[PDB]
Amino acid sequence: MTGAVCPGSFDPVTLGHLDVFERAAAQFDEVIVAVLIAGMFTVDERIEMIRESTADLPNLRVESGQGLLVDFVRERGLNAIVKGLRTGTDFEYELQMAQMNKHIAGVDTFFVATAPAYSFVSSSLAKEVATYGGDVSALLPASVHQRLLGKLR
Amino acid sequence: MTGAVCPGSFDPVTLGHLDVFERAAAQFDEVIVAVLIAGMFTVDERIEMIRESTADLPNLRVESGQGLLVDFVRERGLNAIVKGLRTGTDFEYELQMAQMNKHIAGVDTFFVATAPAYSFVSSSLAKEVATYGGDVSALLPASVHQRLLGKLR
Amino acid sequence: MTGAVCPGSFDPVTLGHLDVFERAAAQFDEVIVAVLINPAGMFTVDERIEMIRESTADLPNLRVESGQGLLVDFVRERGLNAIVKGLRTGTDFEYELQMAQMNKHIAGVDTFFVATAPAYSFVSSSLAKEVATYGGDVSALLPASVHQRLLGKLR
Amino acid sequence: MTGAVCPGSFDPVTLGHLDVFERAAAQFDEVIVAVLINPNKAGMFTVDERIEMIRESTADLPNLRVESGQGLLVDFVRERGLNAIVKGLRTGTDFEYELQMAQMNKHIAGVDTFFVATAPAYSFVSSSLAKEVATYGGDVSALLPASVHQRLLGKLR
Amino acid sequence: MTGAVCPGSFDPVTLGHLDVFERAAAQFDEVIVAVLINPAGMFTVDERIEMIRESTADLPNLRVESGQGLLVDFVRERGLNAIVKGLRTGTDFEYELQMAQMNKHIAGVDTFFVATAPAYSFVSSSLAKEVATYGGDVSALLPASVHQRLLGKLR
Amino acid sequence: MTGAVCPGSFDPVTLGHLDVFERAAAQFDEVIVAVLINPNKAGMFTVDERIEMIRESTADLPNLRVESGQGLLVDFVRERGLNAIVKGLRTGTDFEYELQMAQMNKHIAGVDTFFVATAPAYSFVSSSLAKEVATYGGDVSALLPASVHQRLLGKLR
Ligand SMILES: Cc1c(C(=O)O)cnn1-c1ccccc1
Ligand SMILES: Cc1c(C(=O)O)cnn1-c1ccccc1
Numbered sequence A, B: 001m002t003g004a005v006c007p008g009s010f011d012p013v014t015l016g017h018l019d020v021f022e023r024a025a026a027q028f029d030e031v032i033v034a035v036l037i038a039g040m041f042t043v044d045e046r047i048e049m050i051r052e053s054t055a056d057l058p059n060l061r062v063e064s065g066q067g068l069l070v071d072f073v074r075e076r077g078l079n080a081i082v083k084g085l086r087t088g089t090d091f092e093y094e095l096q097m098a099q100m101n102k103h104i105a106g107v108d109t110f111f112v113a114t115a116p117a118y119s120f121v122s123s124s125l126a127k128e129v130a131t132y133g134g135d136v137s138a139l140l141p142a143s144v145h146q147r148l149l150g151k152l153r
Numbered sequence C, E: 001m002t003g004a005v006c007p008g009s010f011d012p013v014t015l016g017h018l019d020v021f022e023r024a025a026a027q028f029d030e031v032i033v034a035v036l037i038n039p040a041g042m043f044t045v046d047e048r049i050e051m052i053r054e055s056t057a058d059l060p061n062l063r064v065e066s067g068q069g070l071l072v073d074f075v076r077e078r079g080l081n082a083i084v085k086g087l088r089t090g091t092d093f094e095y096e097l098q099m100a101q102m103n104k105h106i107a108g109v110d111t112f113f114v115a116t117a118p119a120y121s122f123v124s125s126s127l128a129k130e131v132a133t134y135g136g137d138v139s140a141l142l143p144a145s146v147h148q149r150l151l152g153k154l155r
Numbered sequence D, F: 001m002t003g004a005v006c007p008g009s010f011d012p013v014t015l016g017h018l019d020v021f022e023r024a025a026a027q028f029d030e031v032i033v034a035v036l037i038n039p040n041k042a043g044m045f046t047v048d049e050r051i052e053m054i055r056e057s058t059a060d061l062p063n064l065r066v067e068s069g070q071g072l073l074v075d076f077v078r079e080r081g082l083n084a085i086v087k088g089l090r091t092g093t094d095f096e097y098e099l100q101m102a103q104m105n106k107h108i109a110g111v112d113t114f115f116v117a118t119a120p121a122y123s124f125v126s127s128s129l130a131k132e133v134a135t136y137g138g139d140v141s142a143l144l145p146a147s148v149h150q151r152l153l154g155k156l157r
């Protein structure tokens, strides 16, 4: 009965996130993606885009969440978070939250290294580049791309 | 059928390592500690010290290993490594090995943040301090302590 | 007569801060904690000062004052030229390193950093407040004097 | 016909920036300083003021020119027939952040980025910190070119 | 006439190195790859030079030479005063930053760093050799010219 | 009666070290420079040579003295009735490494450690790099005190 939660704003989900979801799904019986909550996409849109892109992952589901992440995790009977890291400075920042989360609620955090190809990918940078006309097609799920083009027009 | 391998030299295993073992054991059905191979303790001694300290973990076992870590992992039907991180610079160094390991053999790596109390603990520093008479009792399993005092006399 | 200033917003003071205060008061004849007022937070400056005084009652060579504007002026105005601050991480050091070099360049005021006690490496005022706002228990990270008042502000 | 673009907000230009300009100008046939403006947030200095302050302190660099722009930096670079950006770095933290943007810029436009290490004397200089310190009366004259410092005190007064 | 030196042991050259060579040759009129001999490794200096020449056949403005001793002497002896190097990480930058500042201080030679291509962020000569020694397949990380010879040295 | 210990191998002492000594001497009633010797590996300079080079360049610091030692630093500190160490740091990487040792030292002996940021001019100076560069003929005279530089060239010759 193993399981982890993968949290984030996912505004929108990127190939970097999807890679983390896939890897978490391969190592834990149950994965829940926690869409935490105003950016570009609504909660429902963000959830839909992730569901579309994770259809090949039978042991993953997507839910919105509010309040403390540890409460979200524990209220579903789990006590692990899985999170992707690019740096370095990411680890330092996330370490603080991870130790706090373990301290207040006994919830552990497992970090995975980003796939090399997506080291430079972030939701913020993808939206920024796309806004000014740059091609970010290779960095986002097929569905997501189109939806993003939609929001910009 | 989930599982991870926890690798290291463990010369000797510290409370920092034991904390990682416990956390891995709580999230994966099967944990294997891979004692990799001349420091202070022999392979057999290192294995024994870990077995002594992990008796309360029914789903963990301890084995020696040689060659590529990914071969050790895959030859036991697994494809996850779990490793503890203190920094920062640890993440940078380990990220390189993690991406290499994923590339050559499809083996993933999950990192956990060190418990705050053991941020300064390393096998090397514990042996160094103990050698010159410093008290490292609070940083090592009870059994290990005594064995270390033994080697020094 | 040696001395140092320990600056911060301390909104609220944490056990991490208090550890730094204690270690500074152990090594300098005089320590001044400077509670820096800004454009802002949860506690008033007077509330912050009083919480620090309560937690530092056992440190006779430390006192608490409010400050505004340029830190090196605050320091020099009081006949001192050293700052003492805690650091938790490497990136703590890199940001603080810039300010320390700037402060020494513009006023000849030096800065001494101490490493966090391991137990408080993850505590910050911001994170403590955020966790407490949503019902998380941060009593082990804050002095007794703070935890009671923090409950009051959230109710 | 080699060339590079040195981008920034330069609000204001610092001695650390000028060091980078000089080092780029010494290694590329032409250098363009790109003053990148956010049309949605004014800085301390207007675009013409930023350009003036840069020109006045680069007068001895014959192969350098100064132009403003906005939007994607890689478009600024490519429309001038170049494909190199040169930027200074102070810390490992700077490099991790800039690495993201450099790899993105190479991905979307094939434009490369060359980083140079700050001169030691300016490792702590930034436009924002110099403005903040000057706002509260601190002396930052040794961190800024002469073209900048009294213009800066003027803005604050 | 612009130019730069790309220094390293290149034992063996990787696709990461080659990416840096290509990017340097695209931006400077002349590039010299300097294969630095030391007290040592898997390949002879001549083997290393020949592997780089094979992988850089399409770069007419780049040439490969061996070097010994102080790098800034090598650079200045050839009428240049720029070094170009790849960086993979922040801690790459911090170590290289020291040497770059030293090299500019002692000889006025500057250093330009380029960020690794994402695909090769984890590749190093040391790790490639180590993996290959134990049967791991590193063919995707090394030029074709290297992978054949690496197999030979291990057999 | 405040005091601090400034530890190192000082093989040789650099201008970066001397900056740290001066800053410690300005803030503590007494400073002891601790020349820590590894009885198993000789450096470039003998203990007496290291001490001499330090004394000659700290002659204007009346509250500083120089002593050698080996073994645990915290024992050196405590046997002098002190419990503060002062050390310079250059980078975030330095801090992570030294943080480990500082926390260990506090754990085993209650001895505290105060770090100071390097002077910008010396951020790239290290004993090892200065020796390595000098070995191959590079000029490192501006990074070392006068008490050191020609002694160093002597060793290399
Ligand atoms: C952090 C991140 C974002 C973001 O934070 O916006 C978007 N993608 N990724 C990402 C996640 C894992 C690996 C690579 C990239
Ligand atoms: C890395 C390490 C060593 C070592 O590498 O020698 C000994 N303990 N630990 C450790 C492991 C996890 C958490 C804290 C400390």
Ligand SMILES: Cc1c(C(=O)O)cnn1-c1ccccc1
Binding pocket: C010, C014, C015, C016, C017, C020, C086, C087, C088, C116, C117, C120, C121, C123, C124, C125, C126
């Ligand atoms: C920096 C800090 C904050 C803050 O930034 O608000 C709150 N506590 N601490 C802290 C201070 C010293 C040691 C550990 C933690």
Ligand SMILES: Cc1c(C(=O)O)cnn1-c1ccccc1
Binding pocket: D014, D015, D016, D017, D019, D020, D088, D089, D090, D117, D118, D119, D122, D123, D125, D126, D127, D128
């Ligand atoms: C990054 C920077 C700023 C800024 O970002 O505001 C102002 N100066 N510098 C600088 C540039 C190169 C070297 C040193 C300093």
Ligand SMILES: Cc1c(C(=O)O)cnn1-c1ccccc1
Binding pocket: E010, E014, E015, E016, E017, E020, E086, E087, E088, E116, E117, E120, E121, E123, E124, E125, E126
């Ligand atoms: C640094 C390095 C080595 C090495 O250090 O031996 C081998 N490849 N690379 C590399 C170079 C540029 C980009 C990526 C990787």
Ligand SMILES: Cc1c(C(=O)O)cnn1-c1ccccc1
Binding pocket: F014, F015, F016, F017, F019, F020, F088, F089, F090, F117, F118, F119, F122, F123, F125, F126, F127, F128
């Ligand atoms: C660390 C160091 C060394 C060394 O470790 O060899 C030589 N100088 N410095 C130094 C000390 C303080 C500031 C700058 C530099």
